[PDB]
Each structure stands twice: as C-alpha cells, then as structure tokens.
C-alpha cells in the first residue's frame, strides 16, 4: 500500500490531479493505491502542458507523496518544468481565514464587538459589520491562489464566518493614555514623535480626532503661532497677580490630551466677553472629535441617555451656560453627579470608559444642593479677567470691578478659528504644556479656597 487513505479517497485525489492536467492522461486506469509513486504518468500532449506551458514534454511526469500532499515533478530535466503541489487537508477558505487572523488585522474587544484595521486606523461598526471590507483590503497581502478566490462574495461570507468562529478571546483596547490618535497615525506626547502606518497599530486606539496630522504645520515657528501667543496673552495676561491662574489654565488645557481618568472638574468662571467660548472653540478645532459639547441634563437630569453614552472614550466634555442656579426657578448641581462623573466607569451596554476632562463654563458662581468634603477634593475654577468689548462701551466696562483689562474686540477671530487656522499651533502649545506638567504623572489639584459656597464651611472651620 503506497497510499494512506487517511486524507482523501484515492479516486478523489486522482480526480484532482487529473483536473490539474488539462491534457488527457494516457494510463489513468492503472493508477492505484500501490503504484501511484512508481509508474510514470504518460500524457497525450494535444494541448500545451498545464505546468510548463510548452508544446509537449519529452519525458513523462511523476507523483510523490510528502507532508500530506502530492508533489508533481517532471523526469529528465527538472528545471524544464514547474513543480506542482496538491494538498489534501483543509478547506481552502479555512486556510485563508487562518492567514487573515494570523495577521492580527481583526480583533474583538470586551464589548462583544469586532474592530478591524482598514487604511491605517482601527475601524469599528455595529450596525453594518465590516469584516468583509477587511477581507477585500487584505487580499493584496496574500498569495495569488488566495486573492483569486477572495473576490466572490459568498466565499468572503464563508471566510468571515470562519473568522467569527475562531476569534474567541477578547483583547483590551486604549491602554496608552499619552497617545493622541489621528486618522493617519498616532502622535506620542512624551516625545514629539509621530507614528504613521504599522507603528500606530500596536496602540489599539479605536477613536480619532478626525483630521490628518501634518508635519509642515507642527514645527514651532508658524505663520499663526505669534498671534496665537498674542491671543493667549490677551485672554490670560502674563502678570504677577493673574499668575497662578495662568498655569492652572494651562494644566486644565493640557489635561484634555491624556487618555486616562481625570480626578477633578474645572469651572471656567468669567463675565461676559471674557474668551471662555473662545477657548472652547480653540479646543474643538485643535482636537477634532475628541471634544464634545453636552447639555445640562447630565448635571440636573437623572443619568440612568445619549448625552451620557456619547462620552465613551471622549477626552474632553464641555458644559455650557449654567442658567443661574443661584436664583429661583433652577435645579442645583446635585453633587451626586460629581460623585459619579469622576469615578472611572460611567454607568449609562450601560458601562462606558471615562477619559474626558469635564470643563463647565459659567458667569455666576454656582451652588450645590448639598456640600460635602468629597466636593472639596475634585473642583477647580479658572478666573477670566480680560474684556473684549466694542469701542462704544469701553468706558462702561473700564469702570467695572469685574474686569482688570478691556481690549478691543476683533470680529474676524471666530471665522479664522472656525477655519482651523490655529489648529496645529494651539496643539503644539498643548503638547509643550503637557511635557511641562503631566510628565511623568498626570493628576489635577482642586482649589477649594475660591468658590464662595466653600467659604462658609471654611467659616465653620
């Protein structure tokens, strides 16, 4: 017995090898389980040989059995013909699926979802699964005998089913807090290095700012950098009185790049026309989709809710215009949220990861229904004291004690920042401040000695 019938029926293997030989086989009948490695395969070369593409072959071919496969080789001159291989075990689609998983292009997270690696970014979808798009994208990275058969849609559905049924164990995503993900790579914050390609693959970053990183703008000098300092100097004066507030502001600004849990909530306190919304727009333009504006519901309306589920993996949540909770007809901050919005996992798939710096802007000092010592530890406030008013009412603002300086309003800044003019210079400033403060540790300190409501407790003390 020269054949081991542990792989495939000998008749089926002979049928396969005959199908490979387009030319008619002369002695097909005498091939049995005890001679197929011995008798040469004489072939009537009516058509060109299916292996060497020549008119004919001087000598007959021969078969060998090795490694669970059939090796087809020509006698006489070996280099005159191409060696051929017939496999016997495995559905070819299963081999393709094994190769595709083998690349680590498709993974599953703890959410029972499947993330893929298309166009240098970890794509993900739930309504329309996109494993098959990955298969199209990756067919170029496989031999020809796989690319030729990855085209038919039903074969791709079969390969997708195989991949689904082989990806058992879950991987953890977004473990690097000091990496800023774009759509074309990841920027490292500890260094100034940018990784674009397979280098960004190792950091399983499933979110992105939404715009491509450009090395021609992220230099330092910039056409826009100088007036960006002018604007930041005007909004926050570089003075000895407004000194501590300056680095507090810079720390709050930089804490929006780190992808970890933040231990404080910052209040932008200032009067009208102080530039708080200017900073809001600058951050939005600088970090793309990582910045999100929410409503007042997550402060005054019960959490468990799209406004609490969309903050999943967002690195900055900004709250706008608390409507004078000090006066009547208002709902207080209800500090239970302050208990809730800082602890690492947000309930509201009801579990989401919290990487967001929460910044709330206000014109009036806000009040809580209950004041506790845990509120002492997680609240900081930023004071804004520069006025950008129209030429008409400058004096009426220069005689107000709520402002330390009044500046002439420029009507063109909103359109320019909306055009992402200061998009990269401001990001450069953010990185510079991050290296200045958040290396090697990121943590935020509260300022209990600023909110007037906390004075009474200090009066108790």
């Amino acid at each position: 017995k020269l054949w081991e019938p542990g792989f495939i029926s000998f008749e089926d293997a002979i049928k396969r090898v005959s199908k490979i030989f387009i030319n008619s086989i002369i002695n097909f009948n005498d091939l049995d389980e005890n001679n197929f490695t011995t008798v040469p395969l004489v072939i009537d070369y009516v058509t060109p040989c299916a292996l060497c593409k020549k008119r004919s072959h001087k000598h007959p071919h021969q078969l060998s059995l090795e490694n669970g496969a059939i090796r087809i080789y020509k006698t006489g001159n070996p280099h005159s013909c191409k060696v051929k291989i017939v496999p016997l075990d495995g559905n070819k689609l299963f081999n393709i699926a094994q190769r595709i998983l083998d690349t680590n292009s498709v993974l599953l997270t703890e959410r029972g979802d499947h993330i893929v690696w298309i166009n240098n970014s970890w794509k993900f979808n739930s309504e329309e699964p996109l494993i098959t798009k990955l298969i199209l994208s990756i067919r170029h990275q496989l031999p020809k005998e796989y690319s030729s058969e990855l085209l038919c849609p039903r074969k791709r559905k079969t390969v997708e089913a195989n991949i689904r049924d082989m990806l058992v164990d879950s991987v953890e995503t977004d473990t690097y807090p000091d990496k800023l993900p774009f759509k074309n790579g990841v920027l490292d914050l500890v260094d100034g290095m940018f990784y674009s390609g397979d280098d960004a693959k190792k950091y399983t970053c499933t979110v992105s700012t939404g715009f491509k990183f450009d090395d021609t703008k992220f230099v330092e000098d910039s056409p826009e950098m100088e007036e960006l300092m002018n604007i930041i100097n005007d909004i926050q004066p570089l003075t000895d009185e407004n000194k501590k507030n300056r680095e507090l502001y810079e720390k709050t600004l930089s804490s929006c790049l780190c992808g970890a849990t933040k231990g404080c909530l910052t209040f932008f306190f200032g009067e009208t026309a102080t530039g708080k919304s200017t900073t809001k727009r600058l951050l939005k333009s600088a970090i793309g989709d990582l910045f999100v504006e929410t409503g007042q519901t997550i402060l005054t309306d019960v959490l468990d809710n799209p406004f609490i589920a969309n903050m999943h993996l967002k690195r900055s949540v900004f709250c706008s215009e608390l409507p004078d909770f000090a006066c009547s007809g208002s709902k207080k901050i209800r500090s239970d949220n302050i208990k809730k919005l800082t602890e690492p996992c947000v309930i509201g798939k009801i579990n989401n990861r919290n990487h967001a710096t929460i910044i709330i802007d206000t014109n009036y000092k806000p009040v809580f229904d209950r004041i506790d010592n845990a509120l002492m530890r997680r609240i900081a406030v930023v004071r804004f004291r520069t006025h950008f008013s129209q030429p008409s009412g400058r004096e009426a603002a220069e005689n107000n004690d709520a402002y330390d300086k009044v500046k002439l309003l420029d009507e063109g800044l909103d359109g320019k920042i909306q055009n992402n003019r200061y998009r990269f210079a401001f990001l450069y400033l953010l990185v510079k401040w991050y290296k200045k403060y958040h290396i090697p540790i990121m943590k935020l300190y509260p300022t209990p000695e600023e909110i007037p409501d906390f004075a009474f407790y200090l009066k108790i003390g």
């Binding site: 005959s18 008619s24 086989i25 097909f28 009537d44 038919c152």
Partner: protein, 112 residues
C-alpha cells in the same frame, strides 16, 4: 435549441454525494470536438457562479471514455446505481453512443 429541447437525466442512489448525468439527445458531434471543448468547459467551470458548474468531471474526456450505464452498479461491492427517470422511459435516451439524426437533430464537427 437541439440540446435544450430534448434531453434526459439520470439519478444516482447515493444521497450524500449527488451524482447526476444529463444527456442531450438531439445534438451530435465527434469526440475530438469533445476533447477540444474540455478547455472551454474548464474555463466555464472556473468562471460561472453556479455551484454545479464546479462539479463537472472533465477528466472523463479521455481515450476510450467509460461511463456507468443506467440501471447498473458502479462497482461489484458498491450499491450506487443510476436509475431510470421520468419522463424519458427509453434506455436509448440515456446512451450517448446511440446516434439518431432526425430533422430536429443537429450535427456539427470541427473544420479540422
């Protein structure tokens, strides 16, 4: 029209392996034409999306072509047998070697 309008089908007794033979009665040609066809048959098998188009046995196209006769066992120790099928109750409709060129029948051959 000759091959579509008149044909017969055989059914095998093996259910796990669907084995079938279709014989078009009103079409006749020489065997070298079949051998030359084998090429285009292989390309059609590789290109068509129909699952049955994969499972055509082109290796049967060989000198002294042999096929199991209807009503006869494949092997003495095997019980897979090709049986009669309606509406064709004539065994002559299941023999490709039988030649009956009528007015509806068409014959063709290679120029060379």
């Amino acid at each position: 029209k000759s091959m579509r309008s008149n044909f017969s089908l055989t059914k095998s007794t093996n259910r796990d392996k669907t084995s079938f033979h279709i014989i078009f009665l009103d079409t006749y040609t020489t065997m070298d034409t079949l051998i030359a066809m084998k090429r285009t048959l292989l390309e059609l098998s590789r290109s068509s999306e129909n699952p049955l188009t994969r499972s055509i046995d082109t290796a049967v196209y060989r000198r002294k072509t042999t096929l199991r006769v209807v009503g006869t066992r494949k092997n003495p120790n095997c019980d897979t047998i090709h049986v009669m099928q309606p509406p064709h109750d004539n065994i002559e409709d299941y023999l490709f070697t039988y030649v009956d060129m009528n007015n509806n029948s068409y014959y063709f051959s290679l120029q060379r």
